[PDB]
Structure 1
Amino acid sequence: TVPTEGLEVTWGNNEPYKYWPQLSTNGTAHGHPHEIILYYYELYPTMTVVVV
């Protein structure tokens, strides 16, 4: 699981790998209200649930 803090993976004697997550989502933020709330749900789930 890659959190927003980022993940560092060291594999054997290789140099550690670093991974960070983007703001990818399936919804759209300029369409119908269900679409935009789904978008903000995929981005920030807890915050969007509490605010709605």
Structure 2
Amino acid sequence: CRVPLAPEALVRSGKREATLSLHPIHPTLLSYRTLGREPVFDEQWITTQTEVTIPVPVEGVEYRWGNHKPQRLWSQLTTEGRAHGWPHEIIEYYYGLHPTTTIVVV
């Protein structure tokens, strides 16, 4: 039996957070989960124009919208300004990338 596919979702790629904005023509379903040992997960019904902000850790994130294939996303490493540029930008560069150890070190 045939079934309508849904329009695409254009992602926008923020730091550790990916926002995907839906334009549903019919009421549809969104489903996603994290990838790690800790299974943090949710799913939502979508009716009108709305943004949804799903997390993206280093372990990965899979999500599936409509009747599509499940799509995967992975934070690349991290982002920052100037790394190893001499004055104290080293501690600023380690303010990303698991910062708690850096604070106790400093």
TM-score by length of 2: 0.42
> What count of residue pairs does the alignment treat as equivalent?
52
Superposition CA RMSD, Å: 1.6
Pair member with larger Rg: 2
Q: Residues of 2 paired with 1:33 and 1:43: CA distance?
A: 19
Give the match for residue 2 of structure 1: 56
Q: Does the 8 Å contact 1:2/1:20 carry over to 2?
A: yes
Higher strand share: 2
Give the match for residue 49 of structure 1: 103
TM-score by length of 1: 0.74
Give the match for residue 70 of structure 2: 16
Unaligned runs of 5+ in 1: none
Higher helix share: 1
State the percentage of identical aligned residues.
62
